[PDB]
Structures are given as C-alpha cells and as structure tokens.
C-alpha cells in the first residue's frame, strides 16, 4: 500500500472535463470510476459518455441531481458507450443507448466502501479509483485555485467528484469543473486530522463497479 498513489502517471485517468451549467457531476464521477477499472485489467484506457448516463438514468435527476451509485449499477446492468458515440452536450434527453447500438463497456458489479473510514477509502483507491462526495456548495472550495484544502467547509454533502490518488497527507480529487479550477481541474484535500466525516464530508458515501 504505497506511500504514494497517483493513477494519472499510471495511465488510468484521461484529460479533465466540465459538466457546465448541468448539475450532473454524478455521471461524470462514475465514468471515471468504471473507466479506471476498465483500464486496470484490460490495459485499455477509455473515455465513456456521461451524457448517456444522464439521458438514460431516470432514477437520477439528470441536469440537476443524481446518484453516482445509480450510474455504475446502470452500466453493470446494461453498459455504457464511448464519449465519442455519445459525447457530452450538457442537457438531459432521450436515452440513445439502444438507438446508439451495441454497448462498448459493461462492468460486472458495484460495491460501496464503508462510509467514514479513511483507511478504507485509500485501500480501494489503491486497488482502483472511486466516486466520492462532499461539500462543494462551499464558497472556499469554489475559489480553490491550488492548494491543500482544510476549510473552512461543512458536513452538508452535495457534490460528487473522484479520488485519483493520495499521499501521507493529501488526498487527490478530480473535479467535474473546467481545468480553470483548483490545480488544473485537480484539488488536494488533507487527510489524517481526526475528522471522521472527513473535511467537506468526503467520507460520507463512496463507490465502485467490479470487473473480472
């Protein structure tokens, strides 16, 4: 369980993206999750469509609300297309999955990490990236243009992102905003403080598919 875990230089995460004026970080967080695992075994890095997840997942409320843990489940159940055969537009619409044709990616299950346990988060993040939530409605996290976020912030979780590494002290997160935020679309939050919930409630509820 290395002292350092970066999947970027591991060839697991692709360039950064923006959800835009679409409340859809859940579907984006997911595509990165599935994505990671998909490349971890096969040795093939891919960019899947979040747009599809939006238009297809009726359980989620597309362009403004969702469950990073429906998306995944969805995929495993059905599947998911490339981000070319289903590029992101930013507006929820009619499911094209079927109309689009044969799927391209399809997992083999979804599991959740025991909330409120850093030790647990890491491990999984060590075996493969994960979808995690937190407080973004933040007025500080909103302004982050590089650094190690400690706060201030709260325990009112309401935005989903992704963890793509950690250090002895900083946890790495991929944001669904442009590369005109944090440190090039990236933000480092601090771990090991005692805060069980985890600063910004980053330890509330996390997840991930399964792959054979």
Swiss-Prot record:
Enumerate the residues binding leupeptin: 25
The record's catalysed reaction(s) read: Hydrolysis of proteins with broad specificity for peptide bonds, but preference for an amino acid bearing a large hydrophobic side chain at the P2 position. Does not accept Val in P1'
Activity's sensitivity to pH is recorded as: Optimum pH is 4.
The UniProt entry's GO biological process terms, in alphabetical order, are: proteolysis
| Control of this protein's activity | Repressed by the active-site-directed cysteine protease inhibitor E64 (L-trans-epoxysuccinyl-leucylamide-(4-guanido)-butane) produced by Aspergillus japonicus. Inhibited by the inhibitor of cysteine proteases from Trypanosoma brucei (TbICP, rhodesain) and Colocasia esculenta cv. Kaohsiung no. 1 (CeCPI, tarocystatin). Repressed by leupeptin, a peptidic cysteine, serine and threonine protease inhibitor.
**EC main group:** hydrolase
What is annotated as the active site? 25, 159, 175
For the ligand (E64), the binding residues are 25
Keyword list, A-Z: Allergen, Disulfide bond, Hydrolase, Protease, Signal, Thiol protease, Zymogen
- What are the temperature characteristics of this protein's activity? Optimum temperature is 50 degrees Celsius. Unstable upon 65 degrees Celsius.
| Disulphide bond pairs | 22-63, 56-95, 153-200
| Record-listed E.C. numbers | 3.4.22.2
Output the Gene Ontology terms for molecular function: cysteine-type peptidase activity; serpin family protein binding
The task this protein performs is described as: Cysteine proteinase with a high level of diversity in substrate specificity, an amino acid bearing a large hydrophobic side chain at the P2 position is preferred.
**Hey, which family's this protein in?**
Belongs to the peptidase C1 family.
Q: What is this protein called?
A: Papain
Question: What is the species of this protein?
Answer: Carica papaya
Q: Which residues of the full-length protein are shown here?
A: 134 to 345 of 345
């Amino acid at each position: 369980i290395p002292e350092y875990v970066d999947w970027r230089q591991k060839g697991a995460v692709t360039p950064v993206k923006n959800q835009g004026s679409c409340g859809s970080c859940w579907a984006f967080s997911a595509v990165v999750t599935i994505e990671g695992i998909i490349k971890i075994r096969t040795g093939n890095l891919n960019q899947y469509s979040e747009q599809e997840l939006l238009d297809c997942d009726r359980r989620s409320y597309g362009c403004n609300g969702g469950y990073p843990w429906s998306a995944l489940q969805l995929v495993a159940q059905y599947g998911i297309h490339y981000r070319n055969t289903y590029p992101y537009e930013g507006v929820q619409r009619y499911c094209r999955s079927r109309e689009k044709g044969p799927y391209a990616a399809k997992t083999d299950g979804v599991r959740q990490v025991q909330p409120y346990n850093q030790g647990a988060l890491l491990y999984s993040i060590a075996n493969q990236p994960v979808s995690v939530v937190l407080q973004a409605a933040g007025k500080d996290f909103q302004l982050y243009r590089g650094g190690i976020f400690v706060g201030p912030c709260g325990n009112k979780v309401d935005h989903a992102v992704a963890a793509v590494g950690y250090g002895p002290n900083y946890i790495l997160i991929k944001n669904s905003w442009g590369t005109g935020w944090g440190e090039n679309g990236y933000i480092r939050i601090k771990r090991g403080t005692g805060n069980s919930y985890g600063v910004c409630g980053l330890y509330t509820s996390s997840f991930y598919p399964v792959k054979n």
